[PDB]
Amino acid sequence: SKTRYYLEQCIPEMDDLVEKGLFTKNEVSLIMKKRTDFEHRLNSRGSSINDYIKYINYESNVNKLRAKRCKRILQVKKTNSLSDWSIQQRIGFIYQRGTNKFPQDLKFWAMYLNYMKARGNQTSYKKIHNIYNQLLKLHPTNVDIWISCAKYEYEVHANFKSCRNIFQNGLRFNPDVPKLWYEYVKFELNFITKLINRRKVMGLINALRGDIALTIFDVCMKTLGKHYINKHKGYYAISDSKMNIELNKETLNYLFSESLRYIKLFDEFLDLERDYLINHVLQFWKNDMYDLSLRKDLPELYLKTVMIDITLNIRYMPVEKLDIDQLQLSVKKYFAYISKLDSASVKSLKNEYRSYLQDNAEDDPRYKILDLII
């Protein structure tokens, strides 16, 4: 039997752990009968990931007791013998066995990754790379594993090339969830922000732009639109032109709501050229979307983008020097909108007035602003 093999693999560490005079024979027999129970429950039939988890918790508890007893008996913090790594190696092998048997519970896979990362200097980052590789092989569609893999290899190791490779491979696998798109534009903005801040720092002590984020923004719009028109209206295109235009309108609503979220969490990256990097998404949304977002319905979205293009310089604090510089730009925007619109004219006028009043002695310059926007 293989429980016999594993149990007698456990004996040299307790040889060493009895020789180093911290445990006695009668208590190490007790930890062996508990470990016998656990090994038999592991490699018998009807096994459970809770059996694996309880074995890992028991082995961590006897490791903590071993460390406590070592500090109290020998008054060293490690005996530099077999019995201080064998038990963590055992926990790692219980994790490997469990993930080979039940490779379906991401709770257990993430407990494996957490213990392997928190093992510290003693583990190897290529050993973490191996279990990231096989986990991403088994779950390519689950996207938080791609985010966690790239987050470990950028926010700990700062490996930009491999992080870009992870994000491009994940976007190859599931180019359908917008969350991976948003985390990729987030990673690219974080990388370019660290690039220009190390430039600023080398200047203060002693070309490559957000156009990467704009290009992945562009392919984000194109492929998310393609995958929504392929996901809905699923089997066939058996739908008349009313249902086809209803579908295409709804995909425009979907994609434009995601770009609204993109600008909403795009504004807080204010260390690069945030005006240019928001204005390029503005000009990428301003063009035609093949179903007349401006010249027909989604006119509310056209008014939303017009309000964004108006306040895109007026994204400011109550110190309104930019307003005193270019509020005539907002007035010309309201005039150019009300020169064409019918109820969106009154809506945009009242909305820009309410927005400027809410956002903006100090009340006397604000009395000038109220007389301006009255």
Partner 1 sequence: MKIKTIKRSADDYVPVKSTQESQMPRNLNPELHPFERAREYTKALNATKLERMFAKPFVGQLGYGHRDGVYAIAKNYGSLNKLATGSADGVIKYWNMSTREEFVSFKAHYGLVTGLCVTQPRFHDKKPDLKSQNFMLSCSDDKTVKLWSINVDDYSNKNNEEGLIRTFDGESAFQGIDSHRENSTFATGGAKIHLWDVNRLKPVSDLSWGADNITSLKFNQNETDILASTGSDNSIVLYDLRTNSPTQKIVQTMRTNAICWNPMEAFNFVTANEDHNAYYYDMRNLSRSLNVFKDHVSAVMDVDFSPTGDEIVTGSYDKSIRIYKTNHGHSREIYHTKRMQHVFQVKYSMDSKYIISGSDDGNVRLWRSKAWERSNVKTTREKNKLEYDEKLKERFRHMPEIKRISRHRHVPQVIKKAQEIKNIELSSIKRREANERRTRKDMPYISERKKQIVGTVHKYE
Partner 2 sequence: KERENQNKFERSTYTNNQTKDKKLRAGLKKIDEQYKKAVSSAAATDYLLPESNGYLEPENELEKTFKVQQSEIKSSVDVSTANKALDLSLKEFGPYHIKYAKNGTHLLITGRKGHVASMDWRKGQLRAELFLNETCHSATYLQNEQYFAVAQKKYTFIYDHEGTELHRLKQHIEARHLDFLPYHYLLVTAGETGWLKYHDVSTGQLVSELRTKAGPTMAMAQNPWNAVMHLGHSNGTVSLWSPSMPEPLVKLLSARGPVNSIAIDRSGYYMATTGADRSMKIWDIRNFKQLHSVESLPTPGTNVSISDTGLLALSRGPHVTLWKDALKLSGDSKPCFGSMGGNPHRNTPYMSHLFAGNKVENLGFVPFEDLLGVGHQTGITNLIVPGAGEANYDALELNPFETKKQRQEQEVRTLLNKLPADTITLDPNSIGSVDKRSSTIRLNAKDLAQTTMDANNKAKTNSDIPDVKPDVKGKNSGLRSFLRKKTQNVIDERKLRVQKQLDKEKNIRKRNHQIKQGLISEDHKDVIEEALSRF
Partner 3 sequence: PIEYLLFEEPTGYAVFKVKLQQDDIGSRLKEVQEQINDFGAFTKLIELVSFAPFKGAAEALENANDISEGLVSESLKAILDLNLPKASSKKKNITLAISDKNLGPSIKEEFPYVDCISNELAQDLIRGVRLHGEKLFKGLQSGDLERAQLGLGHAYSRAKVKFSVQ
Residues that bind partner 1 (CB under 8 A): 1, 4, 33, 36-37, 40-41, 44-47
Binding flag, residue 157, RNA (CB under 7 A): no
Partner whose footprint covers residue 148, from partner 1, partner 2, RNA, none (CB < 5 to 8 Å by kind): none
Binding flag, residue 71, partner 2 (CB under 8 A): no
Binding flag, residue 140, partner 3 (CB under 8 A): yes
Alpha helical stretches, state H, the chain: 2-9, 11-19, 25-42, 49-73, 86-101, 106-118, 125-138, 144-155, 160-173, 178-205, 211-231, 241-264, 274-286, 299-311, 321-338, 344-359, 363-372
The binding track of 234-263 with respect to partner 3, each residue x by CB under 8 A or -, is xxx-x-------------------------
The answer to whether the CB of 300 falls within 8 A of the CB of 337 is no
Binding flag, residue 324, partner 3 (CB under 8 A): no
Stretch that binds partner 3, among 233-241, 300-308, 330-338, 345-353 (CB under 8 A): 233-241
* Residue type at position 71: K
Binding flag, residue 362, partner 2 (CB under 8 A): no
Tokens of 211: 């156009």
Among residues 77, 63, 157, 166, the alpha carbon closest in space to that of 117 is found at: 157
**Rounded (10°) CA dihedral 327, 333, 339, 344:** -110
Nearer to partner 3, 40 or 227 (CB): 227
Cα(374)–Cα(368) distance, integer angstroms:
10
**In this structure, what DSSP letter does residue 83 have?**
G
Binding flag, residue 317, partner 3 (CB under 8 A): no
Which H or E run includes 320?
none
Tokens of 214: 């704009």
CB of 140 to partner 3, least distance (A): 5
Cα(92)–Cα(113) distance, integer angstroms:
10
Q: What are phi and psi of 233, to 5 degrees?
A: 55, 65
Nearer to partner 2, 14 or 192 (CB): 14
Nearer to partner 2, 18 or 106 (CB): 18
Helix axes 274-286, 299-311, angle to 10 degrees: 160
Burial of 156: CB neighbours in 10 Å, binned 0-12, 13-18, 19+: exposed
Q: Which of 47, 63, 134, 248 binds partner 3 (CB under 8 A)?
A: 134
Binding flag, residue 45, partner 2 (CB under 8 A): no
Binding flag, residue 72, RNA (CB under 7 A): no
Binding flag, residue 336, partner 2 (CB under 8 A): no
The binding track of 5-34 with respect to partner 2, each residue x by CB under 8 A or -, is --xx--x--xx---------x--xx--xx-
CB of 41 to partner 1, least distance (A): 7
Nearer to partner 2, 50 or 81 (CB): 81
What residue has token string 């989604």?
Answer: 298
CB of 19 to partner 2, least distance (A): 10
Q: Is 236 left (phi over 0), alpha (psi -120 to 50) or beta?
A: beta
Binding flag, residue 164, partner 3 (CB under 8 A): no
CA dihedral sign of residues 75, 78, 80, 85? positive
CB of 6 to partner 3, least distance (A): 20
Q: What are phi and psi of 305, to 5 degrees?
A: -70, -30
Binding flag, residue 33, RNA (CB under 7 A): no
Partner whose footprint covers residue 236, from partner 1, RNA, partner 3, none (CB < 5 to 8 Å by kind): partner 3
Among residues 110, 113, 109, the alpha carbon closest in space to that of 101 is found at: 109
Binding flag, residue 250, partner 2 (CB under 8 A): no
Q: Which of 2, 78, 199, 226 binds RNA (CB under 7 A)?
A: 78
Tokens of 51: 């059996």
Partner whose footprint covers residue 129, from partner 2, RNA, partner 3, none (CB < 5 to 8 Å by kind): RNA
Q: Name the residues that contact partner 2, by CB under 8 A.
A: 7-8, 11, 14-15, 25, 28-29, 32-33, 36
Q: Name the residues that contact partner 3, by CB under 8 A.
A: 101-104, 134, 136-141, 169, 172-174, 176, 227, 230-231, 234-236, 238
